[PDB]
Amino acid sequence: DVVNAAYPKNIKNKAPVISFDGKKGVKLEMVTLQTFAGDDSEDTLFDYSSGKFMPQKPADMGIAWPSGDGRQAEMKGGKGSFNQPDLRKYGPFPDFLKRSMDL
Amino acid sequence: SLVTQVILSADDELRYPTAGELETISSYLKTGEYRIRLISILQGKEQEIIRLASKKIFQLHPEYIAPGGNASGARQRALCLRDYGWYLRLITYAILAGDKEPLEKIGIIGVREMYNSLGVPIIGMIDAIKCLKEATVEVISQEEEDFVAPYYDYIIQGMS
Amino acid sequence: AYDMDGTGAGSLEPRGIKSSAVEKDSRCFKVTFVLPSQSRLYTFRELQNVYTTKMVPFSSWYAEQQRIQKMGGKILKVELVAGGQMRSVGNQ
Amino acid sequence: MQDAITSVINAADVQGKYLDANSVEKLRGYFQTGELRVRAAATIAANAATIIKEAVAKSLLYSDITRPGGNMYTTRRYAACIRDLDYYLRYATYGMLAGDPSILDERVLNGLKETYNSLGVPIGATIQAIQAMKEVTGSLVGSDAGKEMGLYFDYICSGLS
Amino acid sequence: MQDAITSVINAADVQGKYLDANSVEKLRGYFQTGELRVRAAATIAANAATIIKEAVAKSLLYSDITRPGGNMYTTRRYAACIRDLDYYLRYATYGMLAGDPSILDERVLNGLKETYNSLGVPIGATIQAIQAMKEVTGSLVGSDAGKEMGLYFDYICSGLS
Amino acid sequence: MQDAITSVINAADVQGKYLDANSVEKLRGYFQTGELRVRAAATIAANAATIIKEAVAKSLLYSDITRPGGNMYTTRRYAACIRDLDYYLRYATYGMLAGDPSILDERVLNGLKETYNSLGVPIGATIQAIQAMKEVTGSLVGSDAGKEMGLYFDYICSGLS
Amino acid sequence: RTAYPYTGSGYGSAGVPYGQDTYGYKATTAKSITETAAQAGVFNTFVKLLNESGVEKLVEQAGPYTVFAPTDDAFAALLEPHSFNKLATLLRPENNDALRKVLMHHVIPGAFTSASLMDRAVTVKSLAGEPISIMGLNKLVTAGTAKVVRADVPCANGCIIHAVSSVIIPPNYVPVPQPTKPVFPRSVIAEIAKLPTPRQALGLDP
Amino acid sequence: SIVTKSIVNADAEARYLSPGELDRIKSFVLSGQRRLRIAQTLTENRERIVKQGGQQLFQRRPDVVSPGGNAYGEEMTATCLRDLDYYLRLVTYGIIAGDVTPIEEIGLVGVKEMYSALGTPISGVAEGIRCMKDVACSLLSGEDAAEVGFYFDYTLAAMQ
Amino acid sequence: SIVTKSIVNADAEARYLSPGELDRIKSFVLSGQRRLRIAQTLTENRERIVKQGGQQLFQRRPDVVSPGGNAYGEEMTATCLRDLDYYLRLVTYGIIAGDVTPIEEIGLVGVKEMYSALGTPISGVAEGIRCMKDVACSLLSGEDAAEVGFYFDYTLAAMQ
Amino acid sequence: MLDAFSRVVVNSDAKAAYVGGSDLQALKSFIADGNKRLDAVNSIVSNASCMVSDAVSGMICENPGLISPGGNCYTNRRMAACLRDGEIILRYVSYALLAGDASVLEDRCLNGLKETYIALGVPTNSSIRAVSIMKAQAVAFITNTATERKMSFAAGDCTSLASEVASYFDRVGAAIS
């Protein structure tokens, strides 16, 4: 959170850096003295991309082919009216084949 | 669907779809919602219709219901309405994608060997679909039932 | 001779598979694929194994690879076992 | 090999459901764009040779793959390109009509990047040819139709990458 | 493709020696069961369709592989099963007559489990179908003949696993 | 499949330059030995069966691969050898004429050691057979011609190893 | 009963199926060059330098190659006081030019397994274009200054991968100079005075 | 036509015609009244559609008519317009047949062999048909110009 | 070359090379001294053989260089001569290989697809090679001009 | 070493000039101070042959029980391995100084080093002395305040690279403690 209204826009001034240059006066300085930073965040304020850009592939659907049949995983709406239950259930399978339901 | 038949049928000749085929896609897509409006009419009458299908498939064929027949017993008759439910569900697919492949890639291709390994008389299932088409006429007006009539008798032609 | 005489659209022999194979080509692949028949249930022919791995020539890999997907096949792996790459002369 | 209607049916069908109102939004949505796709596939069929001639002249016949040693030097190798680019512009037309990119990976994408590595075909120059071919295709069919035809070009470029 | 006599002759030939007392000792053991195997293969030929109808109804007829989504859903897919189960009951009959399971892996087992993984066919339900098919086969041919025919069923189930 | 002239033209073409003095310098070196290679390939064609009969009798004729259990026992297996050794003496003749061993790995070497491991063919006995076959080939064609024909035999033996 | 049995069926068979597993022509299981190395977990800088430098397209190809991919300890061993002179300049982002040849010196056309180097010394040039001498003597193989660590890795297109201990620099490779200042002569009269006149060349003047 | 290849499609597949095939033969014959009107417009406009067709063709390709061009002189220019009268005629057949099947086996199959063997630039004759297309679609409304132009560009596609 | 396809011929036939094949590899390598002299003449005459080659090409085909021609302007005309430098180079390969095998898989296989796809008149580039042939055979004696011209006309044949 | 700055690929047939789909933004940004970093690693690895021998002999002459017989550096195999491991550690800081982050150091050099040195009986209290000499040696060399050797750099500042490389050496020194 930005809770530093205690620290304004005079945080890191570092007032006591002191250079004597011999026996005379202490030459007080307020040099800011940044870190070995790098500010680790992703997706910054602009795009920075010339096209050279076709990187997008769909995720792997297992053994079938991608997006061809994610049909077991779908939102769907209605079931039917009679619909006898399964009573053995044999595991949920996964993918159906190089194949589809419309054969 | 119908566009899939045009993309496939144009793909084995290594050419784009011709002038006539693009009509066949364009005319099919302009009659789009009317299939969509029609299937919602039939989905609201699936409990309507399969109850009427069990009316006449069994008064016509009491051999199957009687003790000894395949459909004798409760749980045998229980799925009996389920097969009507899947068929009626398939026809809503066929009425939408304006062709026979959802009635053919499912349901028709190899149906006899399925039933013959089950004991269901394959002639009886033909009358079951003919019974199902007889039942759909009552809950449907004259305008749209001849739209759905050619999708039923394809199933009868497929089963023989 | 080779399959690129000048044939394209609107030409007398029918529009078909055109391979970039030279005169008497000697490059051949090692392919692997399954190809379910999708026609046995109305023909009722005997069954044959559909998972094959064989050496197809470069002269006719493209036709075969174009056809293996025609009937819903899936190509698991192909390689160029025999022949060079970027070779101007010597594919013969 | 499924179109938008086949994919909608299937997701209705693999789980065994009927066709419920929410599923039809894409369909009442696919039939609305049915008029746009045919005219898009109409002009692409007409300007097939012109589009491919524009893409190669705009992307790669300008970099030493065209010169000796490059991947496209000999006339057999050059002729294979426009044969090869014809499929990308053709199969993308099929995806634009079917409204589903299932035909691409079924008949184009599978074993494709594994094949170009065998031949030693540069995948980098291939995608930029398709990107340039996507750029000219948006010229002909318009903006939104180019958005549709362009949506399957980068699908090829993504999987081919 | 070797029977019990072919395998006995091969091992006795591969050392270049004649058929000694041990080689003929197994051959006499095979000829003793020659009468049992033919009658076992006799009834299995008669009740081929009945055995497969009994196995599928007893193992995977009602559980979820059959319901939409599972697999045997479509009629092409269901019809492929009884076609597929026919080979297991048929080739097992050949192994029961030949007295050697060499024909199974030669013509059935090789590329089989690698093929079902491609199609996505459940190997778990497949073996239980063959196990149920093995159970009904012991009904027809008797106990010891069922022990013989059953000895090649689990050979298929073992390698197919 | 490139000869010495094809390989010289390829390297001179792959840089897009003409045939300079260095490219023609090797080509002149190949034309000088053109007279030697034909006479070498002449006598090898005449004594093809005699050379293979000499190699097998000198390397692996009486070893226990020849006896029962060895890798060469049955007559089908023995007959496969002289069929197999004929290719090595034949394809080596092609490399001797073409002056480039590209044909060997194109048509012999690839999938060869991977095939013998499948069949269980002993690679150790195979290479001497070729070494003994190389020894008799130096008898016929002479010293330098044997040096040429011998230069492709060990190329087979090296890659087959 | 002989130990080296064989394959096949029918009579004249040893009880072992064809190909030891009933497959005559076995589909391969290896990956290609760069992701056989990606799975190894040791060639991380090698596969990354290939991807950035564009050399990775070259060793994608199906030609039988013999890669001498150095493990990243070899790349980590590039902090020689000596080798850092001739190789640190490549860290600059414009010097991708030399990075491709220096990486292209590690690709050898042909499939040279270590068993094929039984006390044999054979040279060859890379795909960079300059000769490299592979030497295998006394069960220790060498590729220039390689001192190969891992023997061979079977790859996709009949290619081989050997793990080396260092990075082979090409023979006639000169390191690129650091970026400098284009300097110009301040005066013009300090240079006419720098050129010897004709009367000077004949010794007519001092 | 759409009737003959919807038959030979279902002919090869050992089956009858689906609703997808029979609801389009039905949809095509009700379209037949509108097709004859469209072909009737191009029938007695061949004087302008051809002569203005060769108008833009020579302005866009003066090489073919210049001395050395294939259609040079009073003779070849007459035949130069004769081919455009041919292809304009085949488009009238395709409009009434509802497909480029008449245009396919006449003027399209092996057309590159003829024009290459006649010395004619095949790209030049493609430019001629495009010039006829702008004249033809300028004679009809928007609903019709999406058809009459639709058959020309197929001829443009196959002619290169 | 004659060496590589005399091998792959006898390679396919499961046999060695006959005297008919080995008395010609023999006859070709003794011909090799005379072949390099012929190719050496065309090697450093490309300045005249190409520039005078494009000389007669433009005088015989001014359309291709006129405004609208494919090789119009300072740019295309430079590439207009670049292709002639290519095909003149391949003829030097065919003379040294003793066959059009180098010319076959470079500049001949699928050449019509390239030039049709570039908009270039393929007949025009055939005219260019014929103009180079008269310049090339004018640089050699009669015994040589029956060879150097012999490879050009093969390129003329395959280029149409 | 060569993954520490990303390069650009300009020629064709690459798959990264066209279908790269990215430019490496985290490592372009490190050629924005790249010459000053490359002089700093050159300040270490031109003295890395001398920094490891001074530091290992530094902890010998402060804790003399290691070269006593019975100690962990008396025999020749152990004395060669102790000079090897400081050289390997000084290389891996010089990777992490070059790449600008410590993510190379913690898994290839520090992951499983404290379990190794207690599995061999290596004195962990003395090995952290051996890297604190190299912590103090490296900040003299990067700031060019070494007493016996200077190098001719450009005119500028190299603090916040010296404190960057001093933050890696205790990161080593607590991973073995």
Ligand SMILES: *C(=C)C1=C(C)[C@@H](Cc2[nH]c(/C=C3N=C(/C=C4\NC(=O)[C@H](C)[C@H]4CC)C(C)=C\3CCC(=O)O)c(CCC(=O)O)c2C)NC1=O
């Ligand atoms: C024995 C008890 C004992 C030593 C041995 C010696 C080791 C030592 N040195 C330092 C500090 C530095 N060492 C440096 C290394 C070198 N200086 C050079 O010029 C050459 C190139 C190289 C040695 C081969 C440097 C640069 C320093 C920093 C001081 C300086 O500017 O020179 C320490 C650590 C001291 C501390 O941490 O403060 C040790 C232990 N010293 C011994 O006492």
Ligand SMILES: *[C@H](C)[C@H]1/C(=C/C2=NC(=C\c3[nH]c(C[C@H]4NC(=O)C(C=C)=C4C)c(C)c3CCC(=O)O)/C(CCC(=O)O)=C2C)NC(=O)[C@@H]1C
């Ligand atoms: C305590 C922390 C120290 C210590 C301090 C003493 N310094 C003494 C004298 C002295 N100190 C300085 C330096 C200081 N004075 C300045 O004016 C300036 C800046 C210009 C600085 C940095 C000087 C110059 C002197 C005078 C020396 C001389 O006479 O030549 C001192 C003596 C007493 C006093 O003068 O106050 C003390 C005790 N000395 C120590 O021992 C501890 C460690």
Ligand SMILES: *[C@H](C)[C@H]1/C(=C/C2=NC(=C\c3[nH]c(C[C@H]4NC(=O)C(C=C)=C4C)c(C)c3CCC(=O)O)/C(CCC(=O)O)=C2C)NC(=O)[C@@H]1C
């Ligand atoms: C830091 C610890 C030093 C110091 C560093 C500076 N170096 C500056 C510029 C510079 N450095 C190099 C060498 C470096 N760059 C490379 O590409 C390679 C390898 C090939 C190395 C070793 C060069 C070539 C340059 C540019 C030369 C110039 O233009 O003058 C520099 C100024 C630029 C900047 O800060 O970005 C600094 C500060 N200088 C020091 O004082 C400390 C001791």
Ligand SMILES: *[C@H](C)[C@H]1/C(=C/C2=NC(=C\c3[nH]c(C[C@H]4NC(=O)C(C=C)=C4C)c(C)c3CCC(=O)O)/C(CCC(=O)O)=C2C)NC(=O)[C@@H]1C
């Ligand atoms: C010297 C400063 C130390 C000391 C060192 C010894 N280390 C010994 C073995 C050893 N060290 C490592 C870690 C090193 N190897 C690596 O690969 C990496 C990072 C990439 C590092 C830091 C390992 C893994 C091993 C065991 C395997 C090997 O021998 O290399 C060692 C030998 C022990 C013995 O033989 O008894 C010594 C003496 N020990 C000391 O007392 C000082 C403090």
Ligand SMILES: CCC1=C(C)/C(=C/C2=NC(=C\c3[nH]c(/C=C4\NC(=O)[C@H](C)[C@H]4CC)c(C)c3CCC(=O)O)/C(CCC(=O)O)=C2C)NC1=O
């Ligand atoms: C989507 C297409 C599709 C269909 C149709 C299908 C049918 C099907 N019907 C079955 C059984 C059965 N089906 C019947 C059917 C009938 N009895 C009658 O009198 C009638 C005419 C008829 C029903 C209308 C009977 C009696 C059985 C049980 C037979 C037995 O197991 O003893 C079974 C075995 C398991 C089960 O009931 O779920 C299947 C899989 N599967 C499919 O995937």
Ligand SMILES: CCC1=C(C)/C(=C/C2=NC(=C\c3[nH]c(/C=C4\NC(=O)[C@H](C)[C@H]4CC)c(C)c3CCC(=O)O)/C(CCC(=O)O)=C2C)NC1=O
């Ligand atoms: C329908 C899906 C599908 C695709 C895409 C396909 C590609 C395919 N591209 C091929 C070759 C090729 N492809 C190219 C292409 C190119 N060179 C370049 O520099 C460019 C980057 C690129 C043009 C965009 C070339 C030059 C060859 C010939 C390679 C050779 O002769 O070695 C070949 C070898 C056989 C032949 O062309 O006859 C196949 C099979 N096959 C398919 O079934």
Ligand SMILES: CCC1=C(C)/C(=C/C2=NC(=C\c3[nH]c(/C=C4\NC(=O)[C@H](C)[C@H]4CC)c(C)c3CCC(=O)O)/C(CCC(=O)O)=C2C)NC1=O
């Ligand atoms: C003679 C040795 C041999 C065997 C065994 C064999 C199997 C084989 N089974 C197949 C398919 C199939 N197999 C099944 C089987 C099943 N589904 C289930 O849920 C059950 C667990 C199982 C029945 C026991 C199904 C449903 C298909 C169709 C898959 C599809 O359409 O994607 C196919 C694809 C092609 C086709 O059927 O025409 C082959 C080749 N081939 C052979 O040569």
Ligand SMILES: CCC1=C(C)/C(=C/C2=NC(=C\c3[nH]c(/C=C4\NC(=O)[C@H](C)[C@H]4CC)c(C)c3CCC(=O)O)/C(CCC(=O)O)=C2C)NC1=O
């Ligand atoms: C129904 C389909 C069909 C077509 C298209 C057809 C074409 C055809 N065009 C011909 C000639 C010709 N065609 C042209 C054409 C042209 N010159 C140009 O500059 C233009 C680019 C182009 C016209 C737009 C010329 C100049 C000739 C005469 C060529 C000669 O005399 O050598 C001839 C030989 C003379 C004749 O019998 O008419 C035929 C058969 N025949 C057919 O059955």
Ligand SMILES: CCC1=C(C)/C(=C/C2=NC(=C\c3[nH]c(/C=C4\NC(=O)[C@H](C)[C@H]4CC)c(C)c3CCC(=O)O)/C(CCC(=O)O)=C2C)NC1=O
């Ligand atoms: C070795 C076999 C071989 C050939 C022949 C070849 C031809 C070739 N010709 C080209 C262009 C061209 N070629 C021409 C040619 C001509 N214009 C005319 O009027 C004349 C009829 C004709 C020349 C005699 C023109 C004008 C272009 C540029 C076309 C444009 O910019 O659109 C290009 C594209 C630019 C380039 O990369 O050079 C190639 C690749 N490549 C090969 O590898």
